[PDB]
Design a protein around this ligand. Structure first.
Ligand SMILES: O=C(O)CNC(=O)C(=O)O
Ligand SMILES: [Mg+2]
Ligand code: NI
Ligand SMILES: [Zn+2]
Length: 331
């Protein structure tokens, strides 16, 4: 069995190996990458997402989200308070302000310590979940706006044509902006490219151990657990590395820098934080190996998790028994 300790693997494809996305994902899995839940891909040196980032300041962040924490330093929830619209140029200025900027630090490890010690006492603003792309239309390799769609994968594997579309999202981050512990909708893969700016630190639990994290989460967030049998689908709960170590939950950590891709694998729980002003682009995708995870994915039916148009068909076709109850939650 390849990669049996479920370590995060880092790949350095050549320009020749960067041509066929599906084939390279399948190569990574042949080496065991998926067992970690997360992999890093450093693009060939010849490759670029686009020529420059000089003309992005007029992109609008229609609903910036203020991430307000409750709890204790190592075990907290966050809620998202909607703020007034602002442009990317306005947001970057805010991120760089004395109130919001990255503090002086020695290295990534010192910054990680400061994040866990102090996150809860501040409410950073995240420009998350913005439909769009920063890939140049002429970039032919690993262009997250030109991937094969999940609807076409389901059709190719299962023979059923379904409605729905699959497009990327932009994330504009600042110091302490946070992504809570989650897997993807329908336990899909995701791919994330850090276009510019400061790093993003990731934590991940191997897929084979996801239920261990769920059991800990039910213990640490007991009201939330009673409210919903899949409450980590709400994407609001944080648990520190110190707490995970104290409770024997297997995980790994890695920092992504500008110019690098990350892939999350089916049922790979992940969480993390941004180091300073940055812009990432991400999208879900599927492979043939995903189908069985989609069939087994938990669902939120309490009504909190509220998701895309396109998830309807996935539930309907892969989880017909759950369909009725899940749709009541969506309506
Ligand atoms: O970058 C973020 O805020 C969150 N991204 C993801 O969870 C992902 O790419 O799967
Ligand atoms: Mg612009
Ligand atoms: Ni994710
Ligand atoms: Zn729920």
């Amino acid at each position: 069995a390849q990669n049996p300790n479920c370590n995060i693997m880092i790949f350095h494809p050549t320009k020749e190996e960067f041509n066929d996305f599906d084939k390279y994902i399948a190569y990574m899995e042949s080496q065991g990458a998926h067992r970690a839940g997360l992999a890093k891909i450093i693009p060939p040196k010849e490759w670029k997402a686009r020529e420059t980032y000089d003309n992005i300041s007029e992109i609008l962040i229609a609903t910036p989200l203020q991430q307000v924490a409750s709890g204790r330093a190592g075990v907290f929830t966050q809620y998202h308070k909607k703020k007034k619209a602002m442009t990317v140029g306005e947001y970057r200025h805010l991120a760089n302000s004395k109130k919001y900027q990255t503090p002086p630090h020695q290295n990534f490890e010192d910054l990680e310590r400061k994040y866990w010690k102090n996150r809860i006492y501040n409410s950073p603003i995240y420009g998350a979940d913005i439909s769009g792309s920063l890939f140049d239309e002429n970039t032919k390799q690993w262009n997250l706006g030109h991937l094969g769609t999940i609807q076409d994968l389901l059709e190719k594997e299962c023979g059923v044509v379904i409605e729905g579309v699959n497009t990327p999202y932009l994330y504009f981050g600042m110091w302490k902006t946070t992504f809570a512990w989650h897997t993807e909708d329908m336990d899909l893969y995701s791919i994330n490219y850090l276009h510019l700016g400061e790093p993003k630190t990731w934590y991940v639990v191997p897929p084979e151990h996801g239920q261990r994290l769920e059991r800990l989460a039910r213990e640490l967030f007991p009201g939330s657990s009673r409210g919903c049998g899949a409450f980590l689908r709400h994407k609001v709960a944080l648990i520190s590395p110190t707490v995970l170590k104290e409770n024997g939950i297997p995980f790994n950590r890695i920092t992504q820098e500008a110019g690098e891709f990350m892939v999350t694998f089916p049922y790979g729980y992940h969480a993390g934080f941004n180091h300073g002003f940055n812009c990432a682009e991400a999208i879900n995708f599927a492979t043939p190996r995903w189908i069985d995870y989609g069939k087994m994915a938990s669902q939120c039916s309490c009504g909190e998790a509220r998701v895309t148009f396109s998830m309807d068909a996935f539930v309907r076709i892969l989880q017909p028994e759950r369909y009725d109850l899940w749709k009541r939650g969506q309506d």
